[PDB]
Amino acid sequence: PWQECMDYAVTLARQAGEVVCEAIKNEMNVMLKSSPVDLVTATDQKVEKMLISSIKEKYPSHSFIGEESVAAGEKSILTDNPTWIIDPIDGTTNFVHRFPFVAVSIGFAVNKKIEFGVVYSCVEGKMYTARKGKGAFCNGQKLQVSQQEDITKSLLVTELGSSRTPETVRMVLSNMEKLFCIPVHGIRSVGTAAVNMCLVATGGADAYYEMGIHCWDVAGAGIIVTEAGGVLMDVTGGPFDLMSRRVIAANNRILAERIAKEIQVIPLQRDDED
C-alpha cells in the first residue's frame, strides 16, 4: 500500500527527533516570526529542510506543505497529489523552554485525504502512528479512545493560542469558562496540538479543541485519533477541514457535539487562502 512511505516517514520522524533531542540540551537562539510570542529556531528550519530533502530524494513526484516553508513563502495548497504535511517542531515554545513535550509531525494525504500520520514526541520517546484502516499505535501499544459520553465527567485538552489580541484572548478564555462550568472534570494543556491529540487517541483525555491551529498541526494526529476510534469535526459542528484552522478531536460524536455547542467561533484566515 502506502506502507513503504509510512515506514519511511517513521524512520525520518525518529531521525528528526534525535536532532531535536540533542538541540534541546544546548543554547537557544530564539527568533521571532509574526509576534513576540511566535517563536522559531534554527532547529525548526534545519529539521524541516532535512525532512523535505529526504522525502524528495525517495519520492520526487510528491508534494509538500511545511510550516517553515510556508513562512519562507511557499503555499499551503492541498492537491490530490501525494502530499507530506510537516510540522518539524510542534511545540517550539516548549522546545526553547525545555518543557518536555515536543513533537515532529508528518501527515500524508492522497486525494486530499489523510492516509497515514506519524507524531514523534521526542523528549519522552513516544512514537505515535496510524494508517487508515490499520489502527493507531504508540510504541507497540494499540490505542483506543475513552468510552466517556458524559461531558460532566470529561477531561479536555486545549491551548490558549498564539494571539495576544485582548478581544481574541477574551473569547478563548470565555470559551474555556463555558466548558469548565458545565462542569467538566478538568482542562489540560501540554503545549503541543499534536501531542494533545495523541493523548485523546490514548484515552488519557476525552477530547481536544482549538481554534487557530494550522493543517500541519493536525494532519499527523487526526488520523491517529480516528484510528483509535475517535472523531474529528469543526468547532462549528461541521465536517473536519484540514485547512479551516479549527478542530475538535474527541473520543466520540456525543462529546464532540456538546463541545461545539459551547464554542464561540473566532474569525480566522484559512490555510488555503490569501
Write out the catalytic residue numbers.
67, 87, 89-90, 92, 217
CB of 67 to a copy of itself, least distance (A): 17
Contact range with Mn ion by CB under 5 A, out of 91-99, 130-138, 174-182, 200-208: 91-99
The grid coordinates listed for 228 are 483509535
Given the rule CB under 8 A, which residues bind a copy of itself? 30, 36-37, 39, 93-94, 96-100, 146, 152-153, 155, 160, 164, 166, 169-170, 173, 176-177, 180-181, 183-191, 199, 202-206
Which three three-digit cell numbers place residue 36?
A: 513576540
125 assigned to a ligand binding site: no
Q: Which does 67 bind (CB under 5 to 8 A by kind): Mn ion, a copy of itself, none?
A: Mn ion
Q: How far is the CB of 248 from a copy of itself (least distance, A)?
A: 18
State in angstroms the smallest separation of the CB of 207 from a copy of itself. 11
- Binding-site size, Mn ion (CB under 5 A): 6
* Angle value at C-alpha 202, between 197 and 203, nearest 5 degrees: 95
Residue 217, interface with Mn ion (CB under 5 A)?
A: yes
* Closest residue by beta carbon to Mn ion: 90
Residue 123: closest CA among 264, 25, 263: 25
Tally the residues of the chain.
274
87 touching Mn ion, by CB under 5 A: yes
Q: Is 210 annotated as a binding residue?
A: yes
Give which of a copy of itself, Mn ion, none residue 155 binds (C-beta under 5 to 8 Å, depending on kind): a copy of itself
User: Taking the complex as a whole, how short is the minimal distance between the CB of residue 228 and a copy of itself, in angstroms?
Assistant: 13
DSSP 198-234: HHHHHTSSSEEEEES--HHHHHHHHHHHHHTT-EEE-
Of 146, 164, 166, the C-alpha closest to 154 is 146
Per CB under 5 A, contacts with Mn ion among 50-69 are 67
Question: Cell 485538552 sits at which residue?
Answer: 157
- The amino acid present at 245, given as its one-letter code, is R
Phi/psi of residue 88, each to 5°?
A: -70, -35
Give CA separation, 259 vs 153, 226, 270, in Å. 13, 17, 22
Nearest approach, Cβ of residue 250 and a copy of itself (Å): 14
Residue 158 annotated as part of some ligand binding site = no
Widest distance between CA atoms in the chain? 52
Q: Is 217 annotated as a binding residue?
A: yes
Residue 159 binds Mn ion, judged by CB under 5 A: no
Query: At 23, which helix (H) or strand (E)?
Result: helix 3-23
Say if residues 146 and 159 touch (Cβ distance below 8 Å). Answer: no
Residue 66 touches which member of a copy of itself, Mn ion, none, C-beta under 5-8 Å by kind: none
Q: Which residues contribute to the annotated binding site for Mg(2+)?
A: 67, 87, 89-90, 217
